[PDB]
Amino acid sequence: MATVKTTHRTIAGWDGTPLGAFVIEPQDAGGGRYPLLVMPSSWAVPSVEYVGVAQSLAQRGYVVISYSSRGFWESGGSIDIAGPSTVEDVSALIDWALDNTRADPDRIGVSGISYGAGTSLLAAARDPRIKAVAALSGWADLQASLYSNDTPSAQGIALLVAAGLVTGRPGAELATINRNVLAGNYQGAVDSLLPVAAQRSPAASIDEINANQPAVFLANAFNDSLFPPGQLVDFFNRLKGPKQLQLRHGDHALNEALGALGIPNEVYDQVGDWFDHYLKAVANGIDRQPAVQLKSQKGSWSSYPDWQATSKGAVSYGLTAPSGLLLPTGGLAEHGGGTGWNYRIGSGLLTAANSGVAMASGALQMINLPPGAYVPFVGRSAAGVWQGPIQWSAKRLDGAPEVRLTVTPSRANTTLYAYLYAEDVLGNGQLISHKPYTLRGATPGQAKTLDLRLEASSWNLPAGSRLTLVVDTVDLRYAGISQLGGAVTFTSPANAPSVLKVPLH
């Protein structure tokens, strides 16, 4: 193991903006060049040790530049939300390192978390010297993350604002978001960002990254508060070069470098092995590992050669018409359901089915811990509820469930939320996955068939439990546009039956 020297200094960005940086260099001995890692730090969250993580990588035998981006307290400039300047600064710091350290120009990598993860991926698209990327808790599509199916993520946008405010000085884009969020104008925040979001989205540079063919490692939490997994998976799937995706359930750990971000120590252990293989040619077998690796809520791993394999043999459950004397409830019926039925709910009514709890003012929790929902208390005039059978043996859900549903709104503006729960014998539901869907400017009384892809998950369903689908019209974490007084009618036309597809293993 290398012992490393850490030196603080100011390094000029692309336009001269001074960036606060820790330059970490292997000592010992005489004394060839080392692979270089440039690592943009992320949000300033108390207890989070970005430099420490960088030093531990450097001790594997790397020159590492750990640095604060433009606008951070320790730098000049303004936070531009991983804008073109922030991304170009990655290249400027690569140039500086090559000229001022024992860095090998033929073995360059980038790694970051959240702010630094999106920054790192964009740099890999724009700088073909980069041969490997390790991006943690990051995004591919900023619009899809904050404005999923045209539904603003109120709690996601608020967290973006809160994180920015403790990290540095906002540029105009972030200041406009901040002003909108203060008024409760989440839609206005979105509207302000959309015209400049694509240039901040790795997904918009998929061709450029595929051309450059870096080795891309992605590791996120299913329950990331800012950047949900589907938009990451979609990007991952389109990469043509060496790649690995890991998804885990996040929880807070104490007394770890990254525990307050919900990231366990094991992630940067795997990152190390990734870089060691691709940049130092260590034969550690990383190259033979499955491209998709998933860690369930009980902490056990599964793997797949690609994302398509997660959906192999998915079960199609037909939705049946809700029935019952007191608690109208439908079925999830494996080959198959009913067609020709209708079931009307009121829009804008509150249920216990929520993706998250109300969060404090300025809270910096980077993962989300959804509340349980007691299914018998989910108001049937406010929600459609469909229950599958109680399983007598354990099963494992790996992948993204899909719901096809036909809906008829009485108002022009409605937001729908679909939830998949593991419901125990007594009726206690644990949320596995959800998805929002906003219908804006719809024609009242016209039935529309919608396909919702629920967020990717990995879930051990125990014996004694069933899968339960809830669809309602309000969620505490999103700025939905449903109105009390309106209605939604669920149907299942013979032509296009209402069906939940679930990737069980």
**What are the C-alpha distances in Å from 336 to residues 143, 318, 471?**
36, 5, 19
For 439-477, b where at least 16 C-beta lie within 10 A, e where not — what string? beebeeeeeeeeebbbbbbbbbbeeebbbbbbbbbbbbb
The 10 Å Cβ neighbour count of residue 500 is 26
* Residue 324 φ then ψ, to 5°: 145, 150
4-289 and 311-502 in the same fold: no
- CB-hemisphere CA count at 13 Å for 203? 19
DSSP 192: H
- CB-hemisphere CA count at 13 Å for 495? 6
Give the DSSP per-residue string, 380-445.
TTT-EEEE-PPPSS-EEEEE--EEEEEEEESSS-EEEEEEEEEE-TTSEEEEEEEEEEEE-SPPTT
Q: Which amino acid is at 354?
A: N
Q: Angle at CA 38, nearest 5°, toward 221 and 10?
A: 120
For residue 109, is the peptide bond before it cis, meaning its omega torsion is within 30 degrees of 0? no
Q: Is the CB of residue 488 less than 8 Å from the CB of residue 344?
A: yes
- 217, 221, 225, 226: CA torsion to nearest 10: 10
Give the C-alpha separation, 183 to 488, whole Å. Answer: 29
Give the C-alpha separation, 211 to 204, whole Å. Answer: 13
In the structure, how many helices (H) and strands (E) does the chain have?
A: 10, 26
Give the C-alpha separation, 163 to 445, whole Å. Answer: 42
Give the C-alpha separation, 42 to 39, whole Å. Answer: 9
Closest CA to 383 of 459, 333, 328: 328
Which residues make beta-bridge pairs with 246? 219, 293
Give the C-alpha separation, 153 to 146, whole Å. Answer: 5
Give the DSSP per-residue string, 260-304.
GGT--THHHHHHHHHHHHHHH---SSGGGS-SEEEE-TTS-EEEE
Q: Which amino acid is at 5?
A: K
- 10 Å CB burial of residue 386 (0-12, 13-18, 19+) is buried
Closest CA to 466 of 375, 391, 373, 376: 391
Copy the structure tokens of residue 242: 């060496």
Q: Is the CB of residue 199 less than 8 Å from the CB of residue 136?
A: no
- 433, 226, 151, 489: CA torsion to nearest 10: 10
DSSP 5: E
Residues counted in the chain: 505
* Residue 261 φ then ψ, to 5°: -100, 0
DSSP 258: S
* Residue 372 φ then ψ, to 5°: -65, 160
311-502: CATH number: 2.60.120.260
- 10 Å CB burial of residue 326 (0-12, 13-18, 19+) is exposed
For the chain, the 3-state helix, strand and coil shares in percent, each to the nearest 5, are 25, 35, 40
3 state SS of 366: coil
What are the domain boundaries of the chain?
4-289, 311-502
Which residues make beta-bridge pairs with 134? 111, 217
Give the C-alpha separation, 209 to 186, whole Å. Answer: 32
- 10 Å CB burial of residue 335 (0-12, 13-18, 19+) is exposed
Give the C-alpha separation, 421 to 383, whole Å. Answer: 14
Closest CA to 112 of 286, 291, 229, 267: 267
Residue with tokens 């969060």, as numbered in its chain: 359
Which residues make beta-bridge pairs with 458? 398
Closest CA to 137 of 35, 259, 253: 259
Method: X-ray
3 state SS of 210: helix
First to last CA, the chain: 41
What CATH class is the domain 4-289?
Answer: alpha beta
For residue 29, is the peptide bond before it cis, meaning its omega torsion is within 30 degrees of 0? yes
Which residues make beta-bridge pairs with 88? none
Query: What angle do the packed helices 154-167 and 172-183 form, to 10 degrees?
Result: 130
Copy the structure tokens of residue 46: 């108390």
Find the helix or strand (DSSP H, E) in which 340 lies: none
Give the C-alpha separation, 124 to 87, whole Å. Answer: 9
Residue with tokens 């730090």, as numbered in its chain: 41
**What are the C-alpha distances in Å from 54 to residues 3, 126, 174, 237, 441?**
13, 23, 27, 28, 49
Give the C-alpha separation, 204 to 52, whole Å. Answer: 32
Give the C-alpha separation, 34 to 23, whole Å. Answer: 13
* Residue 317 φ then ψ, to 5°: -105, 120
Give the C-alpha separation, 59 to 399, whole Å. Answer: 36
Residue with tokens 């550690």, as numbered in its chain: 284
Give the C-alpha separation, 431 to 433, whole Å. Answer: 6
Copy the structure tokens of residue 43: 């949000």
DSSP 13: -
Give the C-alpha separation, 174 to 151, whole Å. Answer: 19
